[PDB]
Amino acid sequence: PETSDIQTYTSINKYEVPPAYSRLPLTSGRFGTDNFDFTPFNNTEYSGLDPDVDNHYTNAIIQLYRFIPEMFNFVVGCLKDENFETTLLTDLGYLFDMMERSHGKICSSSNFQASLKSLTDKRQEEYLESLCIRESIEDFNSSESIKRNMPQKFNRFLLSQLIKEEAQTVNHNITLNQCFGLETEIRTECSCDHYDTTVKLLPSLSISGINKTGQNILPYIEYAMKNVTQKNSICPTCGKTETITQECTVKNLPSVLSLELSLLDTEFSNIRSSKNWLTSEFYGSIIKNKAVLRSTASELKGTSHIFKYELNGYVAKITDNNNETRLVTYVKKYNPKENCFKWLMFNDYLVVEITEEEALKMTYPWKTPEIIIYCDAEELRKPFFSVDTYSINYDILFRDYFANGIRDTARREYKLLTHDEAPKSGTLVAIDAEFVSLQSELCEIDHIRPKRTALARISIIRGEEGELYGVPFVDDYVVNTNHIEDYLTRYSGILPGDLDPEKSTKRLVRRNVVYRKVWLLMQLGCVFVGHGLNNDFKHININVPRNQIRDTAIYFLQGKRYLSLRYLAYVLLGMNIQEGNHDSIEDAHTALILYKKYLHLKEKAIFEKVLNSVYEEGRAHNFKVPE
Numbered sequence: 001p002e003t004s005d006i007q008t009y010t011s012i013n014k015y016e017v018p019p020a021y022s023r024l025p026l027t028s029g030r031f032g033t034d035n036f037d038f039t040p041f042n043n044t045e046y047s048g049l050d051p052d053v054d055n056h057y058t059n060a061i062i063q064l065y066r067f068i069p070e071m072f073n074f075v076v077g078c079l080k081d082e083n084f085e086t087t088l089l090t091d092l093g094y095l096f097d098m099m100e101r102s103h104g105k106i107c108s109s110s111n112f113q114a115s116l117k118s119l120t121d122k123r124q125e126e127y128l129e130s131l132c133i134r135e136s137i138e139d140f141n142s143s144e145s146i147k148r149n150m151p152q153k154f155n156r157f158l159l160s161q162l163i164k165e166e167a168q169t170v171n172h173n174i175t176l177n178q179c180f181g182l183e184t185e186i187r188t189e190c191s192c193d194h195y196d197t198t199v200k201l202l203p204s205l206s207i208s209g210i211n212k213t214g215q216n217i218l219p220y221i222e223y224a225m226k227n228v229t230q231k232n233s234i235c236p237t238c239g240k241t242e243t244i245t246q247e248c249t250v251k252n253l254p255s256v257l258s259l260e261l262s263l264l265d266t267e268f269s270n271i272r273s274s275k276n277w278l279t280s281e282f283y284g285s286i287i288k289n290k291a292v293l294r295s296t297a298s299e300l301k302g303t304s305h306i307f308k309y310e311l312n313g314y315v316a317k318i319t320d321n322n323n324e325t326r327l328v329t330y331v332k333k334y335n336p337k338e339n340c341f342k343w344l345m346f347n348d349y350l351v352v353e354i355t356e357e358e359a360l361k362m363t364y365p366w367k368t369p370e371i372i373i374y375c376d377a378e379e380l381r382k383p384f385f386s387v388d389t390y391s392i393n394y395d396i397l398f399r400d401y402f403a404n405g406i407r408d409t410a411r412r413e414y415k416l417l418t419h420d421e422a423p424k425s426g427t428l429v430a431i432d433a434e435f436v437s438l439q440s441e442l443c444e445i446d447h448i449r450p451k452r453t454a455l456a457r458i459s460i461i462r463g464e465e466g467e468l469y470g471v472p473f474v475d476d477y478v479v480n481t482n483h484i485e486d487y488l489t490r491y492s493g494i495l496p497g498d499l500d501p502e503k504s505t506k507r508l509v510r511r512n513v514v515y516r517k518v519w520l521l522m523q524l525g526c527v528f529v530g531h532g533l534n535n536d537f538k539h540i541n542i543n544v545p546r547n548q549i550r551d552t553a554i555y556f557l558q559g560k561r562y563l564s565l566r567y568l569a570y571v572l573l574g575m576n577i578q579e580g581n582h583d584s585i586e587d588a589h590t591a592l593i594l595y596k597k598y599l600h601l602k603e604k605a606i607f608e609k610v611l612n613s614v615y616e617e618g619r620a621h622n623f624k625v626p627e
């Protein structure tokens with residue numbers, strides 16, 4: 001894709017949609033055929049997102065929130081404490097963390113999305129409508145993908161839910177609620193003599209867009225801050241026709257302004273007609289009982305604490321020449337060393353460094369701003385902190401946490417960690433995870449994506465030479481309520497006693513206790529051994545650096561043909577997978593054994609010959625296992 005490079009983000013004519021904004025080719029799991037490469041798309045150290053998700057919208061938005069310093073630092077900062085019950089918050093945490101430490105390596109938003117769907121479906125007020133209006137937007141099935149004006153609703157909902165969960169952390173922070181918090185006094189005047197004051201702290205600000213009898217974005221924001229409207233809705237208390245007047249007034253200027261554009265197509269045409277509509281930088285002040293915004297501080301000097309806002313980023317909708325539609329995120333990040341900003345454009349797994357001129361241009365007929373994030377100038381230059389700067393709670397590794405505690409069909413006795421064998425950097429463990437299926441792809445055009453799998457069980461055993469060497473310390477079955485298409489019992493080894501009503505075993509919740517276990521281990525620096533680990537991690541939705549793998553599949557790989565650890569065992573040991581399917585601890589154990597064996601054969605410097613031997617013998621024998 002080089003002739004016209006896929007990363008070309010500019011065209012000669014304004015009507016032509018650049019390759020960078022185009023419909024990217026469908027990604028798939030490492031195939032098979034064939035294995036997909038993301039290196040042509042992303043040349044930055046900033047990770048893109050796997051478009052293989054149902055929500056469709058969120059990816060862009062996710063990126064938009066990834067580069068808000070306060071947002072990022074707080075959300076990833078909450079990970080140090082357990083916070084199991086706050087699903088969306090913590091999942092957004094793990095996701096942010098992963099995107100940060102992947103450093104350009106492709107990331108998936110599958111777990112966060114699964115949490116979102118699990119929440120929105122976790123029902124049988126007026127918010128319920130805003131909840132169930134997402135499943136109509138989720139799981140596609142609605143002609144062309146994007147219908148106005150859902151992303152704004154996604155913004156409002158996400159911020160709201162994150163605030164609600166923020167209220168119920170272990171420290172009950174108001175950080176996000178104080179950051180996005182617009183103290184909005186909305187007053188309803190039933191009559192001139194007598195009026196009515198509702199007060200709401202709103203995380204985002206809706207923008208229309210009517211009259212305002214220069215023509216850039218600032219007076220829009222100003223109008224949305226302080227406006228007088230009338231409503232047509234008749235009050236039922238009389239049954240008569242009631243036209244009420246209502247004034248909405250924003251009182252404060254928070255560190256982050258989240259703006260949701262709800263304009264007409266004609267108004268968008270008026271924006272594209274204008275130039276520099278999206279103001280890169282402005283100054284605001286609270287005068288009287290109104291917020292006033294001007295481009296420079298000299299257009300109005302003001303009195304008290306004049307605030308400076310600079311464009312952090314924005315999510316925009318692109319409608320291609322095909323009339324297909326998709327979301328794309330422009331975002332800005334600060335380089336303090338050179339005292340200058342650099343711009344990034346995110347289109348799923350395509351990430352490109354762009355000029356500010358191109359990032360601010362709104363004149364393109366194929367481009368339409370949807371969500372806009374402004375940030376306090378000083379807060380925007382704060383460094384993005386990592387959770388590694390905090391002391392973290394690893395206590396979940398040393399105790400039991402599950403519902404409910406019936407504990408039947410316990411499997412082989414795994415004993416827990418003690419602080420004498422506390423796992424620090426360099427320590428090694430064996431791991432195997434088994435999944436179940438829930439859905440199955442679509443055909444889409446023939447005269448559209450393989451999905452979906454769900455984590456069912458995960459087993460981690462010790463790898464350090466001790467009394468309990470090779471003895472499991474983790475063997476958890478995952479909490480999953482949703483329907484299971486196929487259990488893959490012959491491949492997975494489920495009972496299936498997966499259901500919480502049918503306690504069955506040590507069923508444990510992946511929100512995100514097991515995920516927190518793995519993430520803590522990886523964050524500590526534990527290297528993981530096993531067979532076929534990449535796919536496992538893709539289904540756990542976690543990314544481990546390759547210097548902690550240690551994958552027998554890769555080592556014993558020859559001629560690009562991946563062999564079953566059943567075959568490897570059977571040839572080099574007693575066949576355990578044949579009798580009897582199926583157990584994760586068994587696969588992990590034999591994988592550990594295989595790694596140690598590989599270490600032996602490597603130390604003796606004879607293993608290339610035994611590789612060419614097991615393959616000569618195999619290729620000749622065509623991989624048949626006696627039984």
Ligand SMILES: [Mg+2]
Pocket residue numbers: 432433434584587
């Ligand atoms: Mg396995």
